[PDB]
RNA sequence: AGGAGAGGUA
């Protein structure tokens, strides 16, 4: 249901999603992507 | 116009912990005794070091600073003389009365990390050995190789300077307050108000007696002088419900030692030093 | 008043437009709010007085307290040649000339 | 960075309690219970033993 | 006595032109600390 | 001279004692002991300069005892009290 | 952001509602370059050119 | 930069003198108002 | 209808409520969430059309009206600003100062491999400490380098007028035990295409001093045969000597000098809420207003700074840190998070501090250390997190 | 450095920087993002009233 | 022929930039054990207009004997006691001595015993007044001294001071009466320091120094601190809720007053006349249009902010009703040493009005909530579509305070408002 | 030794 997930579960999911985002892209990724795109193409 | 007559009663006494009550004295005497035992009692500690091999990840000054803070047994602190007052020698290595030489040597030849604690610190004098509590105070951590060899000496010093010769630790005293209850305004209060008043105290200083349905005073020494119950009584509408005032002539001492000297010995040394200072000041 | 044309003074045009209502307007106290051209209409002294009043108002707005003699000395120094010269180099050069 | 010895505030010997604290944390113990099991009644020692960061491991590794 | 970088070998070279590690290819050398007594005040 | 004596000309039976290399731990107890004597009218200590380790004590007495006599009596009483406290602590510790 | 003159810039020195979640509007250097240098937010990403062709897929949607 | 009016300011208007000291200042209520701690 | 696929656009991830129910099906990578549609990237132009919720609690109150949702409101700020506790409880100017200048000027972790770097003016703190309070951004980043400094017991009280004009009075005993003590490493570089040599006290045969030599003013640090001598305000102990050369054949020499920078009287210290001041006086431990349990305050600050600088939340931070540190006479369900846009209420902090056995307002009764008498007014005490700036006293002496 | 092994990571970098800089002459150089006007949107200005079409590669404004 | 600097020499101290001639002060050299730092009395910071936060003072050591002779005869501190700008005194009590004197003279309920009074008498140069309090209770011995007599040892016996505004009467060097105001202690036309300077002008510096030392000792004996109770500004939770409701109603009333004042234009002359108009409900139901109209005009914005200040003075006046006498912020505000009433209002109750200086391209939605930020027709979303506007005059009211916690939109509004003074 | 460019203090 809409409210079946709960409030604390959504908070934990937000924290986990933030952690995953920081683990994947990292603090700096725009410069790395821009430099990699310049080399390849 | 004459001297006072202090009274001392000891509640708990151990090797490093002592809690005794001082009575019939002014707060000035207690404060002076605390200051003397926290900043004037001399002990022995490492102040000068001389290293030979140091290939660790830490700096030499860092190791020296953490070596100088290691507590040492100071049973001879009162008998030993100061380095500046020693005219027999300028001070180099082992000394008869002032300097005690310490030798340390650690070499790691295994894959596991070697922890250099305070247990492997040898001295010529067996009476100035470091205090052992456990695994001891860790100095550095060594990987494969990375030898560390040094030579250090210890001198008698006052706790006023460098804050490493002070054997005291959290010497406290309270006025031992007395709780006064009018016992007539409590009857006007309802049952729910009594519970609210009891829960208003930050610490467990007031108790509830089920058989009499009235508040009682249990452990009055844990009031901490937090004006919370009085404020709650004022808010409820009773200004003179509970009156709490400190006692000027009663005190409770709490002396905790760092292991250098015993707490009772610390108090005796503080008293002797205060007497010596007063004699010196005497004209 | 608009300043599109500088050929004619604004006060001169204002006087002509107030002919039917000369009695209503009290001309004994009316004066332009400007400082530079007020000396050409009511003399150097009137311009100096208005400058002193404006300086006092500015000091009061600034929140500080300044004695009267300082402001009077400033006014007398900035109008020693009969005109209020600017604080730029040209004004000082003209005053010295 | 090894555990700071002597606990600058109030001067308490806590230089030999880091290994015990780590061992207690390894089990099913919270920070408060672990600090209480080390006989620390003042919050200065608890702050000193709670805010420390183990940095010497990275120094040895790198 | 000088210590190389990624390679472990004592250089011990004092010549002006000798800047490259022997039996190596890198030109980074670290001065080795000898056995000398230094006094510090705690 | 660790202790210096300087009489006050403006006020009779008044003197100032300057003690070098002293702190509040001695001045406070000396001042408190002086207040117990009935002949002492004004008794206090001050530390004007923290960098300059000196203690100045001002003693005003009536026309029955010199300020130096009151100071010596206070010191003797404080020493006796300390000895009594030490004896009590030694008796209690055993 | 490059400005022709440092004495006057305009409205660029003040925060804008377009900064919501992209750059930090609460932190900015103080001085000549006040508001010109903007720190990016934690959840800030910069888009890159897409090699795929979107025109072909647009006609399929309608 | 040292040209024109700046040259005048740095040569004839603004000059540097010897026997000068510059240090950070802290508070000390024990010291008198007309006395400076050196 | 406007569609953009070019580069250079700024976008942020936002939770979508339409696919939020798909999450619950009885650690998830970000790529999986993007593929399943749980999260999506929204540009600046696209955000204006959609309706975005601020918090999870607000989303559940009125559903079916919010198209998107925000993971956390504290992520809107920068990295140097989101870690500041009670950011919205402080004035904008103070937050700006803390997030711009004091963060950069703080002294903390230098590096874990100092041998490979010969950078000039490298400073490292002896005992860096992480803050007691926790921030969601810091927890997600899992890095302790965001905070540089140490936390000490701070009491808001006047001390003989030695802390006036926003000055700071510290404890002499606390500093001497290793608090706020840092080392400074300075490197000197010389390039030679003449050769290195002594050419006729501490220099060796190769032209460089041995490791462990105490260098002073007027002593040659690099010998060329010219030589380079230390200046008036240059001093230190030789740590390492690095010799290197490029492909062109030009030789480079780097010598590093290290020294200990104990907190001096002229040193300037800063807080986490924009409080700036210099050390006013070094007071002995026996003269501080000790509390009932004998915990003397390490740092004493003038109360007059709060009404002027207008920095609330520092007292809240002190109360929260005291509540966390103090034991409970069940440590679970304890408030530790200090998210700037999810700060706990004042009532919760007061209740947490009351359950610890102290006064709910953060003030405790203290006794004067000079006379022993009990002060009439309670003094607020709390272990706030302070920082040490790079500006020293001897660096400004001229 | 990228995609390096565990052994190679121990010796070398201090694992404190993600590597967003350049090595030119021994000094780290970091680029700063430059805010530029969008060249794929119609731009309308005032005084005078005009609308301009930006150029992508060749000057066909 | 050179000798090292010693005590008794004079140096010329200056804090750059030199905004006034009083920056140059000649002071005698005093040697201190401290190194790499110079110590200055906190009172002397007012002539230098500086604080101890990193400020550096560079001094000049005169070499010629004539330069030294003229230095302490014209540029000395005692020669500059009279300010040359307004004619008042140059040196004041300070930020701490003023508060200490206010606390001493205001409480009137704390009595100092013989020991404390004698201890404090050491710093004071004059003698001890009679106790004036023989018995305060039936079973209370050791007669005590009142607080106002402690401050009375700072005046010469021949000095007489009268301040009718604060009902301050000083006769024969004794303070007789004092009610409130703390205006005679602060710098002003009739401050006591100016009268003391005009009386003798030979020992005013020593009197000020002794007063500062005595007040510092007294405040150390008492102790001043700021806790969470000061920021809470309420006795309990019910008082806090009542204060919050009162603040909300006051803000609503101020907004209504501003809306009423916005009608004082030539366009509403027909409505403002005493006649029969059927559009009365139109001017009331159009609540969201008034803010948009205000944000577009400058005269309307000025009228609105003036009306808001006039109606918000009453809201600010509630702090004295909801604040206790022991509140540190209230004490410092009444003493005038630091802060004002509005700062306390922003600390505890509400920030109040927040408006910017220069015009911007966006306008505040007047609500500062989550729903307001998502409104397509809100002024913050470029324009409200009511012709399309291009410029706006921001105008927002923040109901929350710093203690409660700023909303993200409220934080953005505060940052926009405080963006001024960041660029120098 | 003189300059040019950036980050910064009161
Ligand atoms: Mg300043
Ligand atoms: Zn000897
Ligand atoms: Zn402790
Ligand atoms: Zn090699």
């Amino acid at each position: 249901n809409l409210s079946e997930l709960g409030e604390g579960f959504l908070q934990s999911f937000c924290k986990k999603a933030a952690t995953s985002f920081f683990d994947k892209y990292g603090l700096i990724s725009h410069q790395l992507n821009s430099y990699n795109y310049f080399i390849e193409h | 116009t004459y001297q006072r007559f202090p009274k001392i009663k000891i509640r708990e006494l151990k090797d490093d912990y002592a809690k005794f009550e001082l009575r019939e004295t002014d707060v000035s005497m207690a404060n002076a005794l605390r200051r003397v035992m926290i900043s004037e009692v001399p002990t022995v500690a490492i102040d000068l070091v001389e290293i030979e091999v140091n290939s660790s990840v830490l700096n030499d000054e860092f190791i020296a600073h953490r070596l100088g803070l290691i507590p040492l047994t100071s049973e001879r602190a009162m008998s030993m003389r100061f380095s500046r007052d020693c005219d027999a020698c300028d001070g180099d290595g082992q000394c008869e009365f002032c300097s005690v030489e310490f030798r340390l040597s650690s070499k790691c030849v295994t894959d596991q990390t070697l922890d250099v604690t305070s247990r492997d610190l040898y001295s010529a004098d067996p009476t100035v050995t470091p205090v052992d509590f456990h695994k001891g105070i860790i100095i550095v951590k060594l990987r494969r190789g990375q030898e560390l060899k040094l030579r250090a000496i210890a001198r008698k010093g006052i706790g006023k300077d460098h804050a490493k010769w002070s054997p005291a630790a959290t010497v406290t005293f309270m006025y031992e307050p007395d709780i006064i209850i009018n016992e007539d305004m409590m009857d006007t209060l309802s049952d729910e108000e009594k519970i609210d008043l009891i829960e208003s105290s930050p610490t467990k200083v007031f108790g509830m007696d089920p058989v009499t349905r009235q508040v009682v005073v249990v452990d009055p020494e844990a009031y901490t002088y937090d004006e919370e119950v009085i404020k709650k009584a004022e808010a409820m509408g009773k200004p003179g419900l509970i009156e709490i005032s400190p006692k000027d002539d009663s005190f409770i001492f709490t002396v905790e030692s760092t292991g250098a000297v015993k707490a009772s010995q610390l108090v005796l040394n503080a008293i002797d030093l205060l007497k010596q200072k007063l004699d010196a000041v005497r004209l | 008043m608009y300043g599109d044309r500088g050929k004619r003074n604004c006060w001169t045009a204002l006087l002509e437009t107030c002919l039917p209502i000369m009695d209503m307007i009290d001309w004994g106290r009316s004066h332009p709010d400007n400082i530079r051209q007020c000396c050409s209409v009511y003399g150097i002294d009137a311009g100096r007085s208005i400058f002193v009043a404006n300086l006092e108002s500015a000091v009061s707005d600034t929140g500080k307290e300044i004695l009267r003699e300082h402001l009077l000395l400033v006014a007398d120094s900035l109008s020693v040649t009969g005109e209020f010269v600017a604080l730029n180099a040209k004004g000082w050069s003209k005053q010295r000339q | 960075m090894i555990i700071p010895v002597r606990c600058f505030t109030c001067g308490k010997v806590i230089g030999n309690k880091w290994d015990q604290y780590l061992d207690l944390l390894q089990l099913d113990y919270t920070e408060g219970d672990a600090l209480d099991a080390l006989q620390l009644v003042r919050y200065c020692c608890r702050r000193m033993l709670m805010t420390h960061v183990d940095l010497i491991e990275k120094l040895l590794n790198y | 006595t000088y210590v190389c970088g990624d390679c472990g070998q004592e250089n011990t070279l004092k010549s002006g032109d000798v800047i490259q590690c022997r039996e190596c290819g890198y030109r980074i050398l670290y001065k080795k600390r000898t056995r000398r007594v230094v006094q510090y005040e705690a | 001279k660790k202790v210096s004596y300087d009489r006050d000309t403006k006020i009779i039976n008044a003197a100032s004692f300057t003690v070098e290399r002293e702190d509040h731990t001695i001045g406070n107890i000396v001042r408190m002991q002086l207040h117990r004597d009935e002949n002492v009218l004004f008794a206090g200590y001050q530390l004007p300069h923290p960098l300059k380790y000196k203690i100045i004590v001002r003693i005003h007495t009536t026309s029955q005892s010199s300020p130096m006599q009151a100071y010596n009596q206070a010191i003797n009483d404080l020493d006796k009290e300390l000895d009594y406290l030490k004896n009590q602590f030694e008796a209690e510790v055993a | 952001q490059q400005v022709l003159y440092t004495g006057k810039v305009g409205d660029a020195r003040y925060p804008h509602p377009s900064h919501w979640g992209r750059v930090c509007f609460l932190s900015t250097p103080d001085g000549e370059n006040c508001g010109l240098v903007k720190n990016m937010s934690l959840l800030g990403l910069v888009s890159t050119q897409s090699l795929e062709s979107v025109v072909e897929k647009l006609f399929a949607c309608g | 930069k040292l040209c024109g009016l700046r040259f005048m300011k740095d040569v004839l208007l603004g000059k540097r003198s010897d026997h000068t000291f510059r240090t950070v200042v802290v508070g000390d209520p024990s010291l008198k108002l007309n006395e400076i701690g050196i | 209808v406007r569609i953009f696929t070019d580069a250079g656009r700024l976008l942020r991830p936002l939770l979508v409520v339409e696919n939020l129910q798909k999450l619950k099906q009885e650690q998830y990578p970000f790529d999986h969430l993007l593929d399943h549609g749980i999260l999506e990237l929204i540009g600046i132009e696209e955000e204006e059309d959609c309706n975005t919720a601020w918090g999870i609690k607000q989303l559940l109150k009125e559903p079916k009206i919010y198209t998107h949702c925000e993971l956390d409101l504290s992520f809107l700020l920068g990295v140097s600003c989101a870690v500041v506790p009670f950011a919205n409880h402080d004035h904008g100017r103070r937050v700006l100062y803390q997030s711009q200048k004091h963060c950069q000027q703080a002294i903390g972790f230098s590096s874990t491999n100092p041998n490979i770097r010969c950078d000039t003016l490298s400073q490292q703190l002896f005992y860096p400490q992480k803050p007691l309070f926790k921030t969601l951004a810091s927890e997600c980043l899992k890095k302790e380098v965001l905070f540089n400094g140490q936390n000490a017991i701070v009491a808001v009280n006047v001390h003989l007028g030695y802390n006036q004009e926003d000055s700071i009075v510290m404890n002499k005993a606390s500093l001497e035990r290793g608090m706020f003590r840092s080392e400074q490493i300075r490197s000197y570089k010389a390039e030679v295409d003449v050769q290195f040599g002594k050419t006729h006290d501490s220099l060796e045969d190769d032209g460089f001093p041995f490791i462990g030599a105490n260098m002073s003013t007027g002593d040659i640090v690099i010998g060329r045969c010219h030589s380079i001598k230390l200046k008036h305000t240059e001093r230190g102990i030789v740590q390492k000597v690095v010799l290197s050369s490029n492909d062109e054949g030009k030789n480079f020499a780097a010598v590093s000098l290290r020294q200990v920078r104990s907190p001096c009287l002229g040193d300037k210290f800063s807080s986490m809420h924009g409080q700036k001041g210099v050390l006013g006086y070094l007071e002995e431990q026996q003269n501080f207003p000790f509390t009932i349990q004998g915990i003397v305050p390490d740092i004493v600050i003038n109360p007059h700074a709060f009404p002027s600088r207008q920095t609330p939340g520092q007292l809240l931070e002190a109360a929260l840190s005291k509540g966390i540190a103090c034991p409970i006479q069940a440590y679970t369900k304890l408030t530790r998070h200090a998210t700037p846009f999810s700060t706990p209420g004042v009532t919760e902090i007061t209740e947490q501090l009351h359950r610890a056995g102290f006064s709910r307002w953060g003030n405790e009764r203290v006794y004067n250390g000079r006379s022993g008498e009990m002060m009439r007014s309670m003094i607020f005490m709390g272990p706030t997190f302070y920082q040490r700036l790079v500006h020293m006293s001897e660096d400004k002496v001229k | 450095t990228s995609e390096k092994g565990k052994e190679n990571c121990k010796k070398g970098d201090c694992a404190f920087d993600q590597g967003g800089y350049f090595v030119i002459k021994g000094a780290e150089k970091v680029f700063i993002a430059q805010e530029q006007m969008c060249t794929k949107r119609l731009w309308i200005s005032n005084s005078p009233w005009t609308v301009s079409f930006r150029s992508e590669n060749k000057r066909n404004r | 022929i050179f000798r090292s600097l010693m005590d008794g020499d004079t140096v010329l101290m200056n804090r750059p930039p030199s905004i006034h001639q009083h920056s140059l002060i000649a002071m005698t050299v005093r040697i201190l054990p401290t190194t790499s730092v110079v110590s200055l009395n906190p009172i002397c910071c007012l002539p230098f207009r500086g604080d101890f936060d990193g400020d550096c003072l560079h001094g000049y050591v005169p070499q010629s004997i004539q330069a030294k002779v003229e230095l302490d005869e014209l540029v000395a501190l005692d020669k500059q006691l009279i300010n040359r700008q307004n004619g008042r005194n140059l040196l004041s009590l300070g930020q701490d001595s003023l508060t200490a004197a206010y606390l001493v003279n205001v409480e009137k309920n704390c009595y100092l015993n013989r020991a404390q009074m004698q201890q404090l008498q050491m710093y004071c140069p004059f003698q001890l007044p009679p106790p004036a309090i023989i018995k305060a209770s039936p079973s209370s011995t050791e007669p005590q001294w009142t607080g106002m007599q402690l401050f009375g040892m700072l005046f010469p016996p021949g000095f007489d001071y009268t301040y009718p505004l604060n009902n301050v009467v000083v006769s024969n060097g004794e303070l007789l009466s004092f009610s409130e105001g703390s205006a005679w202690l602060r710098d002003g036309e009739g401050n006591f320091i100016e009268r003391l300077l005009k009386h003798d002008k030979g020992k005013v510096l020593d009197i000020i120094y002794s007063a500062q030392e005595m007040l510092s000792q007294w405040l150390l004996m008492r102790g001043l601190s700021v806790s969470l109770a000061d920021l809470y500004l309420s006795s309990d939770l019910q008082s806090r809720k009542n204060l919050t409701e009162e603040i909300s109603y006051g803000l609503r009333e101020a907004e209504q007053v501003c809306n009423k004042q916005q009608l004082m234009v030539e366009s509403w002359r027909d409505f403002l006349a005493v006649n029969g108009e059927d559009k009365e409900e139109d001017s009331v139901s159009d609540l969201a249009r008034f803010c948009y109209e205000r944000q577009k005009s400058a005269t309307l914005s000025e009228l609105a902010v003036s009306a808001f200040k006039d109606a918000y003075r009453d809201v600010q006046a509630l702090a004295y009703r909801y604040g206790d006498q022991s509140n540190s912020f209230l004490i410092m505000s009444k003493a005038g040493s630091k802060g004002n009433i509005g700062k306390l209002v922003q600390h505890s109750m509400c920030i109040g009005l927040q408006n910017s200086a220069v015009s911007l391209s966006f306008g505040f939605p007047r609500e500062l909530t989550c729903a307001a930020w998502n409104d397509p027709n809100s002024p913050l979303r470029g324009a409200k579509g009511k012709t399309t506007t291009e410029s706006y005059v921001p105008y927002g009211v923040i109901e929350n305070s710093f203690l409660t916690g700023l909303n993200p939109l409220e934080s953005f509004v505060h940052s926009v408002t405080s963006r001024d003074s960041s660029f120098s």
Side-chain angles (χ1 to χ4, degrees), chain E residues 16 19-21 24-31:
Chain E
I19 195 60
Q20 186 176 2
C21 165
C24 187
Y26 294 92
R27 306 176 182 179
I28 300 180
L29 299 179
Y30 296 93
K31 186 179 182 61

Side-chain angles (χ1 to χ4, degrees), chain B residues 3 16 25 47 63 157 160 194 217 222 239:
Chain B
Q3 59 164 336
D16 54 354
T25 49
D47 60 329
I63 302 178
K160 182 182 302 300
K194 298 181 179 180
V217 181

